[PDB]
Design a protein around this ligand. Structure first.
Ligand SMILES: *[C@@H]1O[C@H](CO)[C@@H](O[C@@H]2O[C@H](CO)[C@@H](O[C@@H]3O[C@H](CO[C@H]4O[C@H](CO)[C@@H](O)[C@H](O)[C@@H]4O)[C@@H](O)[C@H](O[C@H]4O[C@H](CO)[C@@H](O)[C@H](O)[C@@H]4O)[C@@H]3O)[C@H](O)[C@H]2NC(C)=O)[C@H](O)[C@H]1NC(C)=O
Ligand SMILES: COc1cnc(-n2cnc(C)n2)c2[nH]cc(C(=O)C(=O)N3CCN(C(=O)c4ccccc4)CC3)c12
Ligand SMILES: *[C@@H]1O[C@H](CO)[C@@H](O[C@@H]2O[C@H](CO)[C@@H](O)[C@H](O)[C@H]2NC(C)=O)[C@H](O)[C@H]1NC(C)=O
Ligand SMILES: *[C@@H]1O[C@H](CO)[C@@H](O[C@@H]2O[C@H](CO)[C@@H](O)[C@H](O)[C@H]2NC(C)=O)[C@H](O)[C@H]1NC(C)=O
Ligand SMILES: *[C@@H]1O[C@H](CO)[C@@H](O[C@@H]2O[C@H](CO)[C@@H](O)[C@H](O)[C@H]2NC(C)=O)[C@H](O)[C@H]1NC(C)=O
Ligand SMILES: *[C@@H]1O[C@H](CO)[C@@H](O[C@@H]2O[C@H](CO)[C@@H](O)[C@H](O)[C@H]2NC(C)=O)[C@H](O)[C@H]1NC(C)=O
Ligand SMILES: *[C@@H]1O[C@H](CO)[C@@H](O[C@@H]2O[C@H](CO)[C@@H](O)[C@H](O)[C@H]2NC(C)=O)[C@H](O)[C@H]1NC(C)=O
Ligand SMILES: *[C@@H]1O[C@H](CO)[C@@H](O[C@@H]2O[C@H](CO)[C@@H](O)[C@H](O)[C@H]2NC(C)=O)[C@H](O)[C@H]1NC(C)=O
Ligand SMILES: *[C@@H]1O[C@H](CO)[C@@H](O[C@@H]2O[C@H](CO)[C@@H](O)[C@H](O)[C@H]2NC(C)=O)[C@H](O)[C@H]1NC(C)=O
Ligand SMILES: *[C@@H]1O[C@H](CO)[C@@H](O[C@@H]2O[C@H](CO)[C@@H](O)[C@H](O)[C@H]2NC(C)=O)[C@H](O)[C@H]1NC(C)=O
Ligand SMILES: *[C@@H]1O[C@H](CO)[C@@H](O[C@@H]2O[C@H](CO)[C@@H](O)[C@H](O)[C@H]2NC(C)=O)[C@H](O)[C@H]1NC(C)=O
Ligand SMILES: *[C@@H]1O[C@H](CO)[C@@H](O)[C@H](O)[C@H]1NC(C)=O
Ligand SMILES: *[C@@H]1O[C@H](CO)[C@@H](O)[C@H](O)[C@H]1NC(C)=O
Ligand SMILES: *[C@@H]1O[C@H](CO)[C@@H](O)[C@H](O)[C@H]1NC(C)=O
Ligand SMILES: *[C@@H]1O[C@H](CO)[C@@H](O)[C@H](O)[C@H]1NC(C)=O
Ligand SMILES: *[C@@H]1O[C@H](CO)[C@@H](O)[C@H](O)[C@H]1NC(C)=O
Ligand SMILES: *[C@@H]1O[C@H](CO)[C@@H](O)[C@H](O)[C@H]1NC(C)=O
Ligand SMILES: *[C@@H]1O[C@H](CO)[C@@H](O)[C@H](O)[C@H]1NC(C)=O
Ligand SMILES: *[C@@H]1O[C@H](CO)[C@@H](O)[C@H](O)[C@H]1NC(C)=O
Ligand SMILES: *[C@@H]1O[C@H](CO)[C@@H](O)[C@H](O)[C@H]1NC(C)=O
Ligand SMILES: *[C@@H]1O[C@H](CO)[C@@H](O)[C@H](O)[C@H]1NC(C)=O
Ligand SMILES: *[C@@H]1O[C@H](CO)[C@@H](O)[C@H](O)[C@H]1NC(C)=O
Ligand SMILES: *[C@@H]1O[C@H](CO)[C@@H](O)[C@H](O)[C@H]1NC(C)=O
Lengths: 123, 451, 123, 123, 48
């Protein structure tokens, strides 16, 4: 329990405690200058993944299931040795080569069911 | 068999990342005020009860010597002193020649000039007329030029700026907090030497209270080791590297300025007052710090036991007094209630250790013109304190140094040493690492968005 | 009509005019310093209830119906003496003892139909 | 391809490349002061149309279809001379007289299916 | 043209002597005079 408490837990056990971390990421002298750039730096960094999480369609969600397959060349592991065996940090270090590829597939596949649903709305 | 990418938000993963930490000061102006050279008013209120989360299963790696939490606190205090010394008097008019005479002379002692009674010319009120004023100066701040004539030690190399007499110099604990999206990792190890894995980590919003007290040769009012004396050096085989000791039990040091001084005002210009020393009411005594002879003796045998873990179980370890340098590196200099002491710490480091109530009085002396440390052509004049100074504090460590010759010799000499207040901040922040939290993740889950 | 115009109206009549208030909450000398902290202080205060309103699932809504019951020990009033009788300020003062309880139930109950819907998506 | 690359394309061909523009709108000396007001001015200007796009119900979308008709007095053109013939800048200049009218109909018509769906949730 | 909305059926309570709108305008004008008197002449040479 607590912010980052499930940091050393396997991937599966740390997915139950997402709202602990998600609700903590937002919260003119020498002190005033460095207290004012801490506020600015904390809203622009929080809005950076809110925009990203919105071009993927997972706007107000902590877990969102997408329409892009795994390709099995990004990680050829089981669904059991990934979710109970590897922590989130290990998984990130392993899959860091293909995040910029998976991230670009997540938004090019969302503005494709946004026009397909826009075409289906006229019928 | 087929899997689909699902994004998670709020997954625990972090990276080391230097950022701009800010303030939390528990001791806000408690209806008492007296603004100081630091946080007080401007530092954000602190939590009544801070949250500490013990990250289980997790073993982080700390390096106390590549910490950017102390390279940022170093410049946060050089600029807290600059911003408080800009809005008050500049003592440029006091570069006159002084006609100093010894206060005692044939009064007491060997005719020592510990105090000088200097009279000089100054322009009071009108810029044409200049009347003869006088003040009491210490022998450490007047340089004879040749009842001879003197001059201030500083004003051929630095520019003096009298410290504003309303700000207080008593350190107030400071908590260094991190913005949202960052966390500070605390090593909860009891035998931590600032480098290597820490298998018992913790997460805190911001550090404990850190008094910004700067001293040399002895770390006063600091934090103590939980279990044993801890020796920490950047490179324990380099003589040019300082050694930072940390006491498990404090050694109390009492000292005073037993002279009942009296501040007097001299008008150096229109709307500008120079706060000199009028006279002394009573006997003229000497300042000094007191340390228990037995408590120091046993605490110095705990240091030599740990120094034997790095320098051979069978070696003779002897301490010696500081070799050379400024008066702040060769003497234990601190700031006791707005008064800067430079104590002669030669009775402390006068031992020799082989492998198998009483007090020590250290004759401190006072300085009034203070130069800035990592060097600039700048100085500060500290106006006299009207009264009798008496403060007691804890010694919580040492800043030692080794001398070359440990290649054939079977002995080690450990002169004390300070002068770099970056080694003052890392005797407190050694166990803190700032990390940044990355909350987005992907993972195959065999979900599928409904079309 | 107007920002806060339905301030003295009963709870029911002031729920028809939500978009009036919701559309108004966002909008280096001595003047420049205090004009610059008015902008910063107004986006960080607006993002504080957008994040809160998002861990509850009511992301882009002005009225959101949740899956948590009322418990009847938070307020044992009718549904008619609450919606036509008490203004919003009166209701807030009366229910201020249990907001930190209701708020903590709103997000622990949203990351429970977010994992139930994630489990239902695989079947 | 690229930010604003489809600026001279007809309305129809520039609607396929929305995510290029949408993902680019967020991204104490004399340099420091003017670098700090560029960050502040860029998070507030981004939150002005996120809030607007949220009182209309199109929170996490790049194309949102609404429940308000066109009225044919705002522009009496075909659906083919508008979507393949006029660029977005031309259409904006032509329809600039009625944007403040269409914008106010988009939110008064969204907090009317937000109470209709709120009334339908009780039945 | 400023907007003024009349809150009907609302009765607030005012205390003109615990207002912080005037304890903030007080220091906004001491510091508007300071910032305009720093960049011009200091008549220290006129103490003859
Ligand atoms: C290491 O840490 C210890 C404790 O944290 C410090 O000890 C403090 O030292 C300072 C400086 O001497 C003390 O402050 C001074 O105290 C004098 C006597 O204290 C009386 O008053 C206080 C407050 O009412 C009482 O709590 C106390 O019991 C005594 O009755 C005062 O006479 C001094 O007043 C002068 O300075 C203040 C502030 O500048 C002015 O407002 C006054 O008008 C007057 O000019 C001064 O307040 C402090 O009390 C000590 N605390 C403790 C617990 O002993 C060490 O100084 C510190 N060492 C280092 C090197 O940092
Ligand atoms: C006194 O040193 C300055 C003198 N003068 C100025 N300035 C003059 N004009 C302007 C604009 N600044 C300074 N600014 C920053 C200064 C510092 O932080 C600084 O070096 N120390 C502050 C802390 N410390 C001491 O307490 C001290 C402690 C034990 C023994 C002796 C002295 C060490 C040195 C500074
Ligand atoms: C420092 O020297 C000054 C002289 O400049 C002393 O002031 C004189 O003191 C005597 C005896 O108290 C008086 O009779 C004179 O009238 C004083 N002259 C002035 C101009 O003040 C002062 O007493 C000396 N102070 C110390 C501590 O020795
Ligand atoms: C302060 O200035 C006065 C003059 O205003 C100095 O007194 C003069 O000293 C010279 C020394 O050669 C004599 O010739 C003058 O007759 C003196 N004038 C007097 C006494 O009015 C005094 O020495 C200066 N003191 C300093 C510089 O400390
Ligand atoms: C400012 O004056 C002091 C004192 O006169 C100078 O320091 C002296 O330097 C000489 C040079 O060899 C030494 O012999 C003296 O011992 C020094 N004095 C003291 C008290 O240590 C200093 O160099 C001058 N500043 C300059 C020239 O920039
Ligand atoms: C000097 O050290 C002593 C410890 O010997 C400090 O007194 C302790 O203070 C802590 C909290 O600060 C208490 O939990 C202990 O119970 C105290 N012990 C004793 C024996 O008093 C004292 O506050 C220190 N003084 C300083 C740092 O100025
Ligand atoms: C230091 O000296 C001052 C004198 O300047 C003392 O203050 C005097 O104290 C006595 C009795 O305590 C009073 O009768 C006087 O009226 C005081 N005079 C002034 C000017 O305040 C002060 O008490 C002395 N301090 C110590 C510790 O002895
Ligand atoms: C430093 O001063 C403190 C008091 O400020 C001294 O503590 C006293 O120690 C004696 C032991 O002889 C006790 O009887 C007293 O009760 C203590 N007083 C307080 C207030 O605790 C301490 O002994 C002094 N130490 C040195 C080395 O001078
Ligand atoms: C450290 O202590 C030693 C001796 O205890 C001091 O050595 C003296 O150094 C001076 C040079 O300035 C010589 O003239 C003396 O003959 C030395 N004395 C002895 C007994 O050898 C040294 O001055 C002390 N230094 C400090 C900083 O305390
Ligand atoms: C500090 O104290 C030491 C010893 O208490 C002083 O050392 C004296 O140094 C002189 C010459 O440097 C010798 O003639 C004495 O014999 C030494 N005394 C002892 C007891 O060894 C030292 O001078 C003092 N001051 C400094 C600056 O070191
Ligand atoms: C360090 O300690 C030694 C002994 O503990 C001191 O040796 C002194 O040497 C002189 C030589 O003239 C003798 O007269 C003294 O009696 C010795 N002291 C004792 C206690 O016997 C030495 O002076 C000390 N050095 C310093 C700097 O304190
Ligand atoms: C899967 O990944 C490989 C690796 O680059 C890539 O060549 C391929 O286009 C991707 N898609 C499929 C369907 O395999
Ligand atoms: C993957 O899961 C299957 C399911 O039984 C198991 O047989 C297989 O050994 C697993 N693979 C690994 C590498 O654990
Ligand atoms: C830490 O590792 C131990 C090893 O058995 C395990 O029991 C424990 O569950 C781990 N930590 C957590 C939070 O699960
Ligand atoms: C003051 O005392 C020192 C001590 O050596 C002496 O050199 C100096 O000449 C004395 N000055 C006066 C004015 O007596
Ligand atoms: C006490 O000091 C003496 C020398 O002064 C030393 O020989 C002895 O080892 C010290 N005792 C302890 C317990 O450190
Ligand atoms: C003690 O001496 C032994 C010699 O056998 C040495 O190995 C060890 O490092 C020394 N220090 C200890 C044991 O703390
Ligand atoms: C309702 O509120 C009471 C009051 O504390 C609490 O004890 C109880 O757990 C809540 N839930 C239910 C179902 O009553
Ligand atoms: C609650 O509503 C019912 C519905 O008829 C009514 O009978 C009852 O009197 C109401 N209670 C109060 C306290 O008004
Ligand atoms: C501009 O006109 C040319 C010629 O017809 C056409 O090929 C081109 O597509 C037009 N512009 C864009 C952005 O397509
Ligand atoms: C359409 O636009 C006209 C032009 O102002 C307006 O009078 C009318 O109310 C609007 N609505 C309908 C349904 O025509
Ligand atoms: C509008 O589209 C119809 C569809 O065939 C076409 O007949 C008509 O000419 C078009 N109008 C214009 C102005 O292009
Ligand atoms: C205040 O009371 C009057 C009198 O009944 C009523 O007409 C009015 O609607 C009330 N306030 C509001 C905001 O409606």
């Amino acid at each position: 329990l607590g912010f980052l408490g499930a940091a050393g837990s396997t991937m599966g056990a740390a997915s139950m405690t997402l709202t602990v971390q998600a609700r903590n990421l937002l919260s003119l002298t020498v002190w005033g200058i460095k207290q004012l750039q801490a506020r600015v730096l904390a809203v622009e960094r929080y809005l950076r993944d809110q925009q990203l999480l919105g071009i993927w369609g997972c706007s107000g969600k902590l877990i969102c299931c997408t329409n892009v397959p795994w390709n099995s060349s990004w990680s050829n592991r089981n669904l059991s040795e990934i979710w109970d065996n590897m922590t989130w940090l290990q998984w990130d270090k392993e899959i860091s080569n293909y995040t910029q590829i998976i991230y670009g597939l997540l938004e090019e596949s969302q503005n494709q069911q946004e026009k397909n649903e826009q075409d289906l709305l006229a019928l | 068999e087929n899997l689909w990418v699902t994004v998670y938000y709020g997954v625990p993963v972090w990276k080391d990342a230097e950022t701009t930490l800010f303030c939390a000061s528990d001791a806000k102006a408690y209806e008492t005020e007296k603004h100081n050279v630091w946080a007080t008013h401007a530092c954000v209120p602190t939590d009544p009860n801070p949250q500490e989360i013990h990250l289980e299963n997790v073993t982080e790696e700390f390096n106390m010597w590549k910490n950017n939490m102390v390279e940022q606190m170093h410049t946060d205090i050089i600029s807290l002193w600059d911003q408080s010394l800009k809005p008050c008097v500049k003592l440029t008019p006091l570069c006159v020649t002084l006609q100093c005479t010894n206060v005692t002379n044939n009064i007491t002692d060997d005719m020592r000039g510990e105090l000088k009674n200097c009279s000089f010319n100054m322009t009071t009120e009108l810029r044409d007329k200049k009347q003869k004023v006088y003040s009491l100066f210490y022998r450490l701040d007047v340089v004879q030029i040749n009842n001879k004539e003197y001059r201030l030690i500083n004003c051929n190399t630095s520019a003096i700026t009298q410290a504003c007499p309303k700000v207080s110099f008593e350190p107030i604990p400071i908590h260094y907090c991190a913005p949202a999206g960052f966390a500070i990792l605390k090593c909860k190890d009891k035998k931590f030497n600032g480098t290597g894995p820490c298998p018992s980590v913790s997460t805190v919003q911001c550090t404990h209270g850190i008094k910004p007290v700067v001293s040399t040769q002895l770390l006063l009012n600091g934090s103590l080791a939980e279990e044993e004396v801890m020796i920490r050096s950047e490179n324990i085989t380099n003589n040019a590297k300082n050694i930072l000791v940390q006491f498990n039990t404090p050694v109390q040091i009492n000292c005073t300025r037993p002279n009942n001084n009296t501040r007097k005002s001299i008008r150096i210009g229109p709307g500008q007052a120079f706060y000199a020393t009028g006279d002394i009411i009573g006997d003229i005594r000497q300042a000094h710090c007191n340390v228990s002879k037995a408590t120091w003796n046993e605490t110095l045998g705990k240091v030599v036991k740990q120094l034997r873990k790095h320098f051979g179980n069978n070696t003779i370890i002897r301490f010696a007094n500081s070799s050379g340098g400024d008066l702040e590196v060769t003497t234990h200099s601190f700031n006791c209630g707005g008064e800067f002491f430079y104590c002669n710490t030669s009775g402390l480091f006068n031992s020799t250790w082989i492998s198998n109530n009483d007090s020590i009085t250290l004759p401190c002396r006072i300085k009034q013109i203070i130069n800035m440390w990592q060097r600039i052509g700048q100085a500060m004049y500290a106006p006299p304190i009207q009264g009798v100074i008496r403060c007691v504090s804890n010694i919580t460590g040492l800043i030692l140094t080794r001398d070359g010759g440990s290649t054939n010799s079977t002995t080690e000499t450990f002169r004390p040493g300070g002068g770099d207040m970056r080694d003052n901040w890392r005797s407190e922040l050694y166990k803190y690492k700032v990390v940044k939290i990355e909350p987005l993740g992907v993972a195959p889950t065999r979900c599928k968005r409904r079309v």
